[PDB]
Design a protein around this ligand. Structure first.
Ligand code: BCB
Ligand code: BCB
Ligand code: BCB
Ligand code: BCB
Ligand SMILES: C/C=C1/c2cc3[nH]c4c(c3C)C(=O)[C@H](C(=O)OC)c4c3nc(cc4[nH]c(cc(n2)[C@@H]1C)c(C(C)=O)c4C)[C@@H](C)[C@@H]3CCC(=O)OC/C=C(\C)CCC[C@H](C)CCC[C@H](C)CCCC(C)C
Ligand SMILES: C/C=C1\c2cc3[nH]c4c(c3C)C(=O)[C@H](C(=O)OC)c4c3nc(cc4[nH]c(cc(n2)[C@@H]1C)c(C(C)=O)c4C)[C@@H](C)[C@@H]3CCC(=O)OC/C=C(\C)CCC[C@H](C)CCC[C@H](C)CCCC(C)C
Ligand SMILES: CC(C)=CCC/C(C)=C/CC/C(C)=C/CC/C(C)=C/CC/C(C)=C/CC/C(C)=C/CC/C(C)=C/CC1=C(C)C(=O)c2ccccc2C1=O
Ligand code: HEM
Ligand code: HEM
Ligand code: HEM
Ligand SMILES: CC(C)=CCC/C(C)=C/C=C/C(C)=C/C=C/C(C)=C/C=C\C=C(C)\C=C\C=C(/C)CC/C=C(\C)CCCC(C)C
Ligand SMILES: [Fe+2]
Lengths: 243, 332, 273, 323
C-alpha cells in the first residue's frame, strides 16, 4: 500500500501533472494571448470584449481605438510582394513615415494628480530648479550631426508628476522659432548640447507647437518621432547597409 | 584564494555527465612527496631455523616465524611506530619479555588488528594491504585521530590555537565544520556512523511512492538523518581528496549499478571495516592507554577515513608491502 | 496580416548587410541577412539532431540526449557517434544565437529605437560560451560541457555542482542566485503595480503616476521611478549570469577543491582562529 | 546611443507631492532628504514612510523573531562577541533533532525554532495587511498583495504545511546563512533528487522566465524611452508610438506580440507561478511522492546512460555481508 497509489499504475502526482499543464495553457491561450490582442486589431492587409477604463480627470477611452478621420500615408511599394518594404515618396521627416511615424494619440495636454499640466517649461514651473552638480543648459549652443550650431537652448521642459526633465527648448538659428527635442537624443556637455540625430538644416521642420507653454500627447509623439526618423534619414548614407 | 591553471581531471561516468575528480597538480605532488617517505622493505633473511615459540619467552602472535624474520619484523615495526626513541619505547632495556610499559600491550593488540585487516578485510585493502606506517607515519600517536567530539587541528602534530582547542566552547562550530569540509552541518558523522553500527547511513527510499506505515508521523525517520548522511559523505569526500562523482552518478545517489562506480562498493566495505576496528579493537583499549591519551568521556582515539588515506583516494598512492611482510596478513 | 498601425512602420532600411535584397517580411517575421543565416543554423542543427536521435536508444523527449566526446579526446576532432554530433550542434547553436541577435539589431534600426534588447541577449549568449567553450578551453577537453537533452543536462549540473562538494557556497553562484531572486521579485512588484493603477476594480477611476510614487513610499519608503525600474530590471536580470560567469569559470581552472573550503580567507585569519 | 537610459544627465528638483489616501494621511513620518548620486540611477527622494497599525506590528513580530535566533546564535559561540562575528554565517537556529512528531519540541531541540517561526508568520501576515490596505487606501488594485500572498504561501509550505502533512517538525527549514543552505541539500536527498520533480522544473522555468521577461521588457522600455515609453499609464489608455514600436519589434522577431498592459500580466503570472508551482511540488513531496527520481523511472520519463566504469552491485545484498 502506497500513499497516493490509486487505480491502475497511476498516482496522484501523475494526475496533477496533467492538471498543471491544464491550467497553464488555459491561462496562456484563453486569457494571456487574448489580452495581447486588445491593441492593434483587427488584421489589416479569439477576440476579447473591448475593455473600459475610467480616466483620472473625467471621461473614458476604449481600447483599441477608432478615430473619426484617417491619416493618408505618402508611401509606395518597392515590389509586388506582400511583405515587400515601402519607400518614402518625398521627405519622410515631415510626412512622418517609418521611424518618423507618430501614433494617433489624443490632442490634450497631459495632467498631474492635481490636474495641472504635466509637461511644462521652467517659466510655467517656477518652483522647479536644477539640482546642484549638473549643467544648466540655458545659454549653451546646440551642435548638430554635421558639426554645425543649429541653435541655443532657451528653457527646460519638466514633467510635474515624476520630477524628471524630458525636453530641451531651443530657438532655431535662422528661423526665429523654437523647436523641442527629447533628452534621449542629446549628449549633455558643459559647453555644448550634442545632437547626432538630424542635420542643422533640418531643425526648422521640427513639428510646431499649438501653444508655447503647453504640449499635448500627440505633439509629444510628433516631436519624438521626428528625430527618430533622422536616425535613418538624415544623410543619404543612413538608409543603406553599413558594410 | 585561487588554484592556478591548469587542473588534472578524470572521467568516472558516461561522457557528458561531467563525472570525475577535480585535482590541483601542486597539491597532489605535495601529497606524493609526503607519502614517498614510506620506508623501503628490509633485506631478505634466512628462513632456516626453529620458530620463536621455542626460542623466546613471551611471544603469542608471531610465534611461527624464525628468529631472523622476528628481529626483521621488530626492526621494521620500530621504523614505522617509534623511531625517535627506538626499542625502549615499548620495551624495558634489560628485559625484552616483560610488559612493564604501556606501548607493549597495545602493540600486541594492534598486531592482531593489522593481521585481521589484510586477512579478513581484503575486499577493501586487496593485495595492496596496510602496515604500521599507513596511519602512524613514523610517530607513536597517529596524526589523524578522532574522539567522541570534533577536535582541531585534524593533524594533532600541529600546535592548536585557543579557539580550536576542545576546551573553549566558542569554537565548537569551527571544529564541527572543518570535519564536514567547511559545512555548517550540525552533525558529527564519526560518532553516529563511523564509531558504531547503531545508525543506518541510507536515508533514501527505494519506492517511487511512500509506503503506508512508515511515512506518517513517528513512523518516519527525522530529516536529521538525511543531514547526517550528507555530513558523513562530506567527511568521506574530503578524506580521500575527491568528490561524489568518484562513487556516484549525482542523478541518483541511492541507486547502484551503472549509477555507482566500482569504488563505491570499496567505500561501503570501508565503512564496515572502520566500525569493526573502532568497536572490537579501538574501543576496549581505553584501559590499556593512560589518562593522558584519553579524550573527555573516557574514550580511546579511534580511526575513520583519513587515518590511512590522509587526503588521497588510495593510502600512499597504491604502495604495497604485503608481499614484503607476510606476517601482517593474509594469515593461513 | 498586419496590425492596425504596422503598415506605416514597414519601410526599407535597417539592414547591416545584404542591403535591399534581404529587406522584406515573411508573414509577421522579418528576415534580413542574419535571418537567412539563422534559419540555416537552426535547420542544419535540428537536422543533425534528428540524425543523432535515430542513432540513440529511445524517442522519448524527456530521455533524448546527445552528449559531448570523452575527456581523453581533448579539444581535437571526435568521431560522429562519439561526441562528434555534439561538436556540430554547438557551432550550429552558437551561429543561431549570434545571427538572431544581429537580426534583432536589423529590426531595431528600422524602428528608430534603442539597441538595448539585442545587447541584453548578449548576456545569455555569453553565459552559453562560458559553459560550452570558455571553461572547457581552460581545462583541455570538450567533454566537460553539458549534453543536449531535456532531462540529461540536469544530471550534468548535478554532478558538476557536486564535484566541488557544495555549490551553494560558491561566491559567484551566491550573487548569481541573489540576482535571480531579486529580479523575479521586482517583476512581481512592477508587473503588479502597473495592473493595480490601471485596474482599481469595479467602477473606480484609473489613478496617476503620483499614486505609483505614493504606494512604495507608504510600503517601503523608497521608490525607484518609472524609467529607473526598467533600468534596474535589466540590471538585476543581467547580473544573474554576469556574476554567474565568474562562479562557473573559477570552478576547475581557478579552484579544484570544494567551494565551502573557499571560505578559508575569513575563518582562518590568525587573530581569531 | 541614448545617454538618458544610462544615467540621469540632468536631475529635476521641486516641492514633494503628497497624495491623500482614505485613511492615515497624518501617519507619514520622515523629513525628506535628497541624494545626488542615487538621482543619477533613480529617484533622489528618500522618504517619507508610512507606519500604521499593520506596519508597526510587523516590526514588533519581526524583531521578536530575529531576537530569538540571534540569542541562539550567540549561545553556540558561548557568548563570545569576537567568535560571533567570525562564525556568523555558519551559525543558526535548528529544528528538533530526534523524532517527536507534531507535539511541541523541547526548548533546546527545535523549541526556540518553532517560536522564531511563529513570530515570523505573524510578521509576514501583518505586513501583508500593510501591502493590502495601502492599495485600498490609495484606490488601487490588490495585485501586489496577491503576488505577496503566493510568496507567503510558499514559505508556509516549507515552514509548517509540509511538516503537518508528513507529521514531523524536523522537516522544517533551519534559520541561518549556511544552515538554511544545508537544508536545500538535505531535503533534495530525502525525496530522491529534486531535479526529477516536474514542479521544481516548472518553478525554475518561471524563475528563469522572470529573468527573460525583465531582461526583455526592461531593455524594451529603455529602447523607446525617447518616445515616452516609461509613461506606461498613458500608453495603455492612449496607444503611443513608444508602445507601437515596442510591439512591432517582437512581432518582426518572434511572430506575435503583447500589448503595453498585457505584457505586465505576463510578468506577473510568471512571478506568481514561481510560488504556485513551488507550493504544489512541496505539497506532493512527502505526502504522495517518496522518491522523485524513481517517480520519473516509474513513469519512464527518466533517461539512462551506459556504464563507463564497471557496473557496481549493492554489497549489502551479498550472501553473508555485514548489516
Ligand atoms: C527554496 C528557497 C530557499 C532559499 C534559497 C537560497 C539560495 C540558493 C541562496 C539564498 C540566499 C539568501 N537567502 Mg534564501 N532566504 C532568505 C534570504 C536569503 C539571504 C540570506 C540570501 C540573499 C538572497 C537575496 O539576495 O535575496 C534577494 C533580495 C530581495 C528580494 C530584497 C532586496 C534587498 C536589497 C538588496 C536591499 C536594498 C535595501 C538597502 C539596504 C537600503 C538602502 C539604504 C539607503 C538609505 C530569507 C529572509 C528567507 C526566508 C523566506 O526566511 C530565505 C528562504 C530561502 N532561501 C528558502 C528556504 N537563498 C543567497 C545567499 O547568499 O545565501 C548563502 C543564495 O545564494
Ligand atoms: C547540484 C546542484 C547545485 C547547483 C549547480 C549549478 C551549476 C554547475 C551552475 C549553477 C548556476 C546557477 N544556479 Mg545553481 N542554483 C540556483 C540557480 C542558479 C543560477 C542563479 C545560476 C545561473 C544559471 C545559468 O548559468 O544559466 C545559463 C543559461 C543559459 C546558458 C541559456 C542560454 C540562452 C540561449 C542563448 C537561448 C536559447 C535559445 C533556444 C535554443 C531557442 C528555444 C526556442 C523554442 C521556444 C522553440 C538556485 C535558485 C538554486 C537553489 C534554489 O538552491 C541553485 C542550487 C544549485 N545549483 C545546487 C546547489 N548551478 C550557474 C552559475 O552561473 O553559477 C556559478 C552554473 O554554471
Ligand atoms: C545551470 C544552468 C543550466 C540549466 C539547468 C536547468 C534546470 C535546473 C531546469 C532547467 C529547465 C529548462 N531548461 Mg535549462 N536550458 C535549456 C532548456 C531548458 C528548458 C527545457 C527548461 C525551461 C527553462 C526556461 O524556462 O527558460 C526560459 C525560456 C522560456 C520561458 C521560453 C521557452 C523555452 C522552452 C522551455 C525551451 C524548450 C527547449 C526544447 C528542448 C527545444 C530544443 C530546440 C530544438 C528546436 C532543437 C536550453 C535550451 C539551454 C541553453 C540553450 O543553454 C538551457 C540552459 C541551462 N539549463 C544551463 C546550462 N534548466 C527546467 C526544466 O523544466 O527542465 C526539465 C528546469 O527545472
Ligand atoms: C541540492 C539542491 C537542489 C535544490 C533544492 C530545492 C528545494 C528543497 C526547494 C527548491 C525550490 C526551487 N529551486 Mg531548487 N533549483 C533552482 C531553483 C529553484 C526555484 C525555482 C525553486 C523555488 C526557490 C524560490 O523561489 O524560493 C525563494 C523565495 C522565497 C523563499 C520567498 C521569500 C519571500 C518572503 C515572503 C519574504 C521574507 C523576507 C522577510 C523580509 C523576512 C521576515 C522574517 C523575519 C520575521 C525573521 C535552480 C535554478 C536550480 C539549478 C540551476 O539546478 C535548482 C536545483 C536544486 N534545487 C538542486 C537540485 N530547490 C523550491 C521549490 O520550488 O519547491 C518544490 C524548494 O522548496
Ligand atoms: C515571486 C516571489 C518573489 C518575491 C515577491 C514579493 N516579495 C515581496 C512582495 C512580493 C510581491 C511585497 O509585497 C513585499 C514588499 O514589501 O516589497 C518590497 C515583499 C518582500 N520581500 C522581501 C524580501 C525577500 N523576497 C524574497 C523572494 C521573493 N519575493 C520571490 C523571488 C526573498 C528571498 C530571496 O527569499 C527575500 C529575503 C522584503 C523586501 C519584503 C517583505 C517585508 C516583510 O514582510 O518583512 C517582515 C519583517 C519585518 C517587518 C521585521 C523587519 C526587521 C527590522 C529590521 C527590525 C530589527 C530587528 C532587530 C535586529 C531584532 C531585535
Ligand atoms: C539576461 C539573460 C536572460 C535572458 C534574456 C533574453 N533572452 C532572449 C532575449 C533576451 C533579452 C531575446 O532577444 C531573445 C528572444 O527572442 O526573446 C524571447 C531571447 C531568447 N532566449 C531564449 C531562451 C532562453 N533564455 C534563457 C535565459 C535568459 N534569457 C536569462 C534569464 C534560457 C535558459 C535560462 O536556459 C533559455 C532556454 C529564446 C526564447 C530566445 C532566443 C531565440 C534565438 O536565439 O533563435 C535562434 C535559435 C533557434 C530558433 C534555435 C537554434 C536551433 C539549434 C541549432 C538547435 C538547438 C541546440 C541547443 C543548444 C540544444 C539544447 C537543448 C537541451 C538543453 C534540451
Ligand atoms: C516563416 C519563416 C521561417 C520566415 C523566415 C524569417 C525568420 C528568421 C523567422 C524566425 C522564425 C522563428 C525561429 C520563430 C521562433 C521565435 C521564437 C524564439 C519564439 C519563442 C516563443 C516563446 C515561447 C516566447 C516566450 C516569451 C513570452 C513569455 C512571451 C510573451 C510576452 C511577450 C509577447 C513579450 C514581448 C513584449 C515585450 C518584452 C515588451 O516590453 C512590450 C512592450 C509593449 C508592447 C508589447 C510588448 C511585447 O510584446
Ligand atoms: C628493533 C627494535 C626491537 C627489537 C630488537 C625487539 C625485540 C623483541 C624481542 C627479542 C621480543 C621477545 C622477548 C621475549 O619474550 O623473549 C619482543 C617481543 C615483543 N615486542 Fe619487541 N623489539 C623491538 C621493538 C619493538 C617495538 C617498537 C614494539 C611496539 C611497537 C615492540 C613490541 C613487542 C611486542 C608486541 C612483542 C610480543 C611478540 C608477539 O607476541 O608478537 N617491540 N621484541
Ligand atoms: C560529499 C559528497 C557525497 C555526497 C553528497 C554523496 C551522497 C550520498 C547519499 C545521499 C547517499 C545515501 C543514499 C541512500 O540512501 O542509499 C550515499 C551513499 C553512499 N555513498 Fe556517497 N556521496 C558523496 C561522496 C561519496 C564518496 C567520496 C564515496 C566514496 C568514498 C561515497 C560512497 C558511498 C557509499 C559507500 C554509500 C552507501 C552508504 C551505506 O550503505 O553505508 N560517497 N551517498
Ligand atoms: C569509512 C572509511 C573509508 C572509506 C569510505 C574508504 C574508501 C575507499 C575507497 C573508495 C577506496 C577505493 C580507491 C580506489 O581504488 O581508487 C579505498 C581504497 C583503499 N583503502 Fe579506504 N576508505 C576508508 C578508510 C580506510 C581505512 C581505515 C583503511 C585502513 C585499513 C583504508 C585502506 C585502504 C587501502 C589500503 C585502499 C587501496 C586498495 C586498492 O588497491 O583498491 N581505508 N578506500
Ligand atoms: C501550532 C503552532 C503554534 C505552530 C505553527 C506555527 C507556524 C506557522 C510555524 C511556521 C514557521 C516557519 C514559517 C518557518 C520558516 C522558516 C524559514 C523558511 C527560514 C528560512 C530562511 C532563514 C534565513 C535565511 C535566516 C535569516 C537570518 C539571518 C539573516 C540572521 C540575522 C538577521 C540579520 C543579520 C538581519 C538584521 C538586520 C540588521 C542589519 C539590523
Ligand atoms: Fe513595465
Amino acid at each position: 500500500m502506497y500513499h497516493g497509489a490509486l487505480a491502475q499504475h497511476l498516482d496522484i502526482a501523475q494526475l496533477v501533472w496533467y492538471a498543471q499543464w491544464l491550467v497553464i495553457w488555459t491561462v496562456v491561450l484563453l486569457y494571456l494571448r487574448r489580452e495581447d490582442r486588445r491593441e492593434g486589431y483587427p488584421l489589416v492587409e479569439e477576440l476579447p470584449y473591448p475593455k473600459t477604463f475610467v480616466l483620472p480627470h473625467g471621461g473614458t477611452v476604449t481600447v483599441p481605438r477608432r478615430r473619426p478621420e484617417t491619416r493618408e500615408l505618402k508611401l509606395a511599394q518597392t515590389d509586388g510582394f506582400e511583405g515587400a518594404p515601402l519607400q518614402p515618396t518625398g521627405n519622410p521627416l515631415v510626412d512622418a513615415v517609418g521611424p518618423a511615424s507618430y501614433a494617433e494619440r489624443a490632442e490634450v495636454v497631459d495632467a498631474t494628480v492635481d490636474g495641472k499640466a504635466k509637461i511644462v517649461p521652467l517659466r510655467v514651473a517656477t518652483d522647479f530648479s536644477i539640482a546642484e552638480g549638473d549643467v544648466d543648459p540655458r545659454g549653451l549652443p546646440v551642435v548638430a550631426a554635421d558639426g554645425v550650431e543649429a541653435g541655443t537652448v532657451t528653457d527646460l521642459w519638466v514633467d510635474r508628476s515624476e520630477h524628471y526633465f524630458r525636453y530641451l527648448e531651443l530657438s532655431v538659428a535662422g528661423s526665429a522659432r523654437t523647436a523641442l527635442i527629447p533628452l534621449g537624443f542629446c549628449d549633455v556637455k558643459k559647453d555644448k548640447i550634442v545632437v547626432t540625430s538630424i542635420l542643422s538644416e533640418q531643425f526648422a521642420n521640427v513639428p510646431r507647437l499649438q501653444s508655447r507653454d503647453q504640449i499635448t500627447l500627440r505633439e509629444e509623439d510628433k516631436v519624438s518621432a521626428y528625430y527618430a526618423g533622422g536616425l535613418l534619414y538624415a544623410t543619404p548614407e543612413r538608409a543603406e547597409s553599413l558594410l | 584564494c585561487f588554484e592556478p591553471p591548469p587542473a588534472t581531471t578524470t572521467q568516472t561516468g558516461f561522457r557528458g555527465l561531467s563525472m570525475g575528480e577535480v585535482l590541483h597538480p601542486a597539491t597532489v605532488k605535495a601529497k606524493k612527496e609526503r607519502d614517498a617517505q614510506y620506508p623501503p622493505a628490509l633485506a631478505a633473511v634466512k628462513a632456516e631455523g626453529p620458530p620463536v615459540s621455542q626460542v623466546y619467552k613471551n611471544v603469542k602472535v608471531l610465534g611461527n616465524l624464525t628468529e631472523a624474520e622476528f628481529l626483521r619484523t621488530m626492526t621494521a615495526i620500530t621504523e614505522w611506530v617509534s623511531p625517535q626513541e627506538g626499542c625502549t619505547y615499548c620495551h624495558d632495556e634489560n628485559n625484552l619479555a616483560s610488559e612493564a610499559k604501556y606501548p607493549y600491550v597495545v602493540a600486541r593488540r594492534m598486531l592482531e588488528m593489522t593481521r585481521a585487516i589484510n586477512t579478513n578485510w581484503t575486499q577493501h585493502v586487496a593485495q595492496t594491504g596496510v602496515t604500521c606506517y599507513t596511519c602512524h607515519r613514523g610517530t607513536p600517536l597517529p596524526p589523524y585521530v578522532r574522539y567522541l567530539e570534533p577536535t582541531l587541528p585534524l593533524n594533532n602534530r600541529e600546535t592548536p590555537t585557543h579557539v580550536e582547542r576542545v576546551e573553549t566552547r566558542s569554537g565548537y562550530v569551527v571544529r564541527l565544520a572543518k570535519y564536514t569540509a567547511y559545512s555548517a552541518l550540525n552533525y558529527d558523522p564519526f560518532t553516529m556512523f563511523l564509531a558504531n553500527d547503531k545508525r543506518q547511513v541510507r536515508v533514501v527510499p527505494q519506492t517511487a511512492l511512500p509506503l503506508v506505515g512508515v511515512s506518517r508521523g513517528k513512523e518516519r525517520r527525522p530529516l536529521s538523518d538525511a543531514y547526517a548522511t550528507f555530513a558523513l559523505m562530506m567527511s568521506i569526500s574530503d578524506s580521500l581528496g575527491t568528490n561524489c562523482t568518484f562513487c556516484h552518478n549525482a542523478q541518483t545517489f541511492e541507486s547502484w549499478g551503472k549509477k555507482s562506480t566500482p569504488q563505491r562498493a570499496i567505500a561501503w566495505w570501508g565503512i564496515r571495516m572502520v566500525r569493526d576496528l573502532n568497536m572490537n579493537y579501538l574501543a576496549p583499549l581505553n584501559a590499556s592507554l593512560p589518562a593522558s591519551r584519553l579524550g573527555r568521556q573516557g574514550e580511546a582515539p579511534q580511526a575513520d577515513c583519513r587515518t590511512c588515506h590522509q587526503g588521497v583516494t588510495k593510502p600512499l598512492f597504491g604502495a604495497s608491502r604485503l608481499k614484503d611482510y607476510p606476517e601482517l596478513g593474509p594469515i593461513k | 496580416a498586419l496590425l492596425s498601425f504596422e503598415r506605416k512602420y514597414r519601410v526599407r532600411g535597417g539592414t547591416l548587410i545584404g542591403g535591399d535584397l534581404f529587406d522584406f517580411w515573411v508573414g509577421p517575421y522579418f528576415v534580413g541577412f542574419f535571418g537567412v543565416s539563422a534559419i540555416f543554423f537552426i535547420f542544419l542543427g535540428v537536422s543533425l539532431i534528428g540524425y543523432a536521435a535515430s542513432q540513440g536508444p529511445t524517442w522519448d523527449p524527456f530521455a533524448i540526449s546527445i552528449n559531448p566526446p570523452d575527456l581523453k579526446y581533448g579539444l581535437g576532432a571526435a568521431p560522429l557517434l562519439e561526441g562528434g554530433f555534439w561538436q556540430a550542434i554547438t557551432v550550429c547553436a552558437l551561429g543561431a544565437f549570434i545571427s538572431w541577435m544581429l537580426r534583432e539589431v536589423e529590426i531595431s534600426r528600422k524602428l528608430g529605437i534603442g539597441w538595448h534588447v539585442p545587447l541584453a541577449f548578449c548576456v545569455p549568449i555569453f553565459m552559453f560560451c562560458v559553459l560550452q567553450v570558455f571553461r572547457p578551453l581552460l581545462l583541455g577537453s570538450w567533454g566537460h560541457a553539458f549534453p543536449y537533452g531535456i532531462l540529461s543536462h540536469l544530471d550534468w549540473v548535478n554532478n558538476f555542482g557536486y564535484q566541488y562538494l557544495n555549490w551553494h557556497y560558491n561566491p559567484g553562484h551566491m550573487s548569481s542566485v541573489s540576482f535571480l531572486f531579486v529580479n523575479a521579485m521586482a517583476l512581481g512588484l512592477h508587473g503588479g503595480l502597473i495592473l493595480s493603477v490601471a485596474n482599481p476594480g469595479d467602477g473606480d477611476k484609473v489613478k496617476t503616476a503620483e499614486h505609483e510614487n505614493q504606494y512604495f513610499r507608504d510600503v517601503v519608503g523608497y521608490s525607484i521611478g518609472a524609467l529607473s525600474i526598467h533600468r534596474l530590471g535589466l540590471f538585476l536580470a543581467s547580473n544573474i549570469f554576469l556574476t554567474g560567469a565568474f562562479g562557473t569559470i573559477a570552478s576547475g581552472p581557478f579552484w579544484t577543491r570544494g567551494w565551502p573550503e573557499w571560505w578559508g580567507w575569513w575563518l582562518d585569519i590568525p587573530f581569531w582562529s | 546611443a541614448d545617454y538618458q537610459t544610462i544615467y540621469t544627465q540632468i536631475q529635476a528638483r521641486g516641492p514633494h507631492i503628497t497624495v491623500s489616501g482614505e485613511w492615515g494621511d497624518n501617519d507619514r513620518v520622515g523629513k525628506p532628504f535628497y541624494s545626488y548620486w542615487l538621482g543619477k540611477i533613480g529617484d533622489a527622494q528618500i522618504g517619507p514612510i508610512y507606519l500604521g497599525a499593520s506596519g508597526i506590528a510587523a516590526f514588533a513580530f519581526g524583531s521578536t523573531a530575529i531576537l530569538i535566533i540571534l540569542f541562539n546564535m550567540a549561545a553556540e559561540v558561548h557568548f563570545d562577541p569576537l567568535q560571533f562575528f567570525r562564525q556568523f554565517f555558519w551559525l543558526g537556529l535548528y529544528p528538533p533533532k530526534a523524532q517527536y512528531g507534531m507535539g511541541i519540541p523541547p526548548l533546546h531541540d527545535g523549541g526556540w525554532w518553532l517560536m522564531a517561526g511563529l513570530f515570523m508568520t505573524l510578521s509576514l501576515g501583518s505586513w501583508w495587511i500593510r501591502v493590502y490596505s495601502r492599495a485600498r487606501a490609495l484606490g488601487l488594485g490588490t495585485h501586489i498583495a496577491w503576488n505577496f500572498a503566493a510568496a507567503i504561501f510558499f514559505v508556509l509550505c516549507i515552514g509548517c504545511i509540509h511538516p503537518t502533512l508528513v507529521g514531523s517538525w524536523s522537516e522544517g527549514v533551519p534559520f541561518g546563512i549556511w544552515p538554511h543552505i544545508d537544508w536545500l541539500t538535505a531535503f533534495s536527498i530525502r525525496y530522491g533528487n529534486f531535479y526529477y520533480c516536474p514542479w521544481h522544473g516548472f518553478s525554475i522555468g518561471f524563475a528563469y522566465g522572470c529573468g527573460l521577461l525583465f531582461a526583455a521588457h526592461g531593455a524594451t522600455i529603455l529602447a523607446v524611452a525617447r518616445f515616452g515609453g516609461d509613461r506606461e499609464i498613458e500608453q495603455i489608455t492612449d496607444r503611443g508610438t513608444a508602445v507601437e514600436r515596442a510591439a512591432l519589434f517582437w512581432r518582426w522577431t518572434i511572430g506575435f506580440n503583447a500589448t503595453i498592459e498585457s505584457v505586465h500580466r505576463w510578468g506577473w503570472f510568471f512571478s506568481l507561478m514561481v510560488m504556485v508551482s513551488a507550493s504544489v511540488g512541496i505539497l506532493l513531496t512527502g505526502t504522495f511522492v517518496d522518491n522523485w527520481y524513481l517517480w520519473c523511472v516509474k513513469h519512464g520519463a527518466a533517461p539512462d546512460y551506459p556504464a563507463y566504469l564497471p557496473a557496481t552491485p549493492d554489497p549489502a545484498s551479498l550472501p553473508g555481508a555485514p548489516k
